[PDB]
């Protein structure tokens, strides 16, 4: 396969298409599809789908992530969602359609929204490692207050895949909500970065995704024996991750929008919107 074959960066050349290590930012217009759609099939490529609903996010988000990514997640090809959740028992079991497949594990619940959100990259780390490595080919790790509004499909799949984050996609580096705290492992000192990722969605294959989520975890104890936090937990250390290790395809903020900013002419098919202001 050919970057030809699939990305076509100049039918959008109002925004960034393509960074400097060359990795493609998939915008709407810019993706055949098609093309990659019966490539991938060729290739029997099944993808998976982490998710995690612990207090009450489970009745507040989980039915309506999990309907809409039946719907609208790498349609045509076998998917598997792992759904984590600290009360089985309150899991929404919707029908899912052809080639959706699920299983759900009882996680232990988090006191802190800000733990529960960090130990995150703990979790998806061991379940990689026990079975989704052996399951899926990609892999994608999303929060669970958002919708999909549209096709995500195999124009997102990639070895290491980031999403740009809606509010800063067109801000200077300087702008950006790093960590600026060199007591941090997360840290990212002014004058560094590239992008700024949304934690909200990030994947690749189950090697790399593993490779994510335990830097991303490490750093996060390293802070906690360090007595400090990142200011934006598992984001700040997923930035410093990426900055470090260049993600190999970036998702443009029509992959994860807020409605909130309003509608912009560079977001043209909102594949995925938030759920909360923020
Ligand atoms: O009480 C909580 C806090 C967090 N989360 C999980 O971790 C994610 C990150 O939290 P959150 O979405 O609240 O962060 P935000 O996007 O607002 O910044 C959520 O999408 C959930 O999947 C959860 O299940 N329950
Ligand atoms: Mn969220
Ligand atoms: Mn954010």
Redesign the pocket.
């Known amino acids: 396969l050919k970057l030809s074959d699939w990305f076509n960066p100049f039918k959008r050349p109002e925004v960034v298409t393509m960074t400097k290590w060359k990795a493609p930012v998939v915008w709407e217009g810019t993706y055949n599809r098609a093309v990659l759609d019966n490539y991938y099939a060729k290739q029997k490529i099944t993808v998976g789908l982490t ?7 489970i009745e507040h988000y989980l039915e309506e992530f999990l309907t809409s990514a039946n719907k609208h997640f790498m349609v045509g090809h076998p998917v598997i969602f792992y759904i984590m959740v600290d009360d089985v028992s309150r899991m929404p079991l919707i029908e899912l359609g052809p080639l959706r497949s699920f299983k759900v594990f009882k996680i232990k619940p988090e006191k802190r ?1 800000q733990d ?2 960090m130990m ?1 990259m703990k979790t998806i780390g061991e379940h990689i490692v026990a079975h989704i490595q052996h399951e899926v080919d990609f892999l994608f790790c999303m ?3 958002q919708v999909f509004q549209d096709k995500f499909g195999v124009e997102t799949l990639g070895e290491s895949v980031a999403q740009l984050q809606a509010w800063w996609y067109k801000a200077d580096p300087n702008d950006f909500t790093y960590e600026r705290r060199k007591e941090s492992a997360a840290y990212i000192p002014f004058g560094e970065g590239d992008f700024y990722y949304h934690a ?1 969605i990030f994947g690749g294959t189950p090697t790399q995704v593993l490779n994510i989520t335990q830097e991303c975890f490490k750093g996060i104890l390293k802070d906690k024996k360090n007595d400090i936090e990142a200011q934006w937990h598992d984001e700040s250390h997923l930035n410093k991750y990426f900055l470090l290790n260049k993600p190999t395809k970036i998702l443009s903020p029509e992959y994860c929008w807020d409605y909130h900013i309003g509608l912009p002419a560079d977001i043209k098919l909102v594949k995925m919107s938030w759920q ?1 202001k ?1």
């Open positions: 998710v995690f609903a612990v207090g009450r996010y929204w529960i959100s995150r929060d669970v207050d909200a909360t923020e």
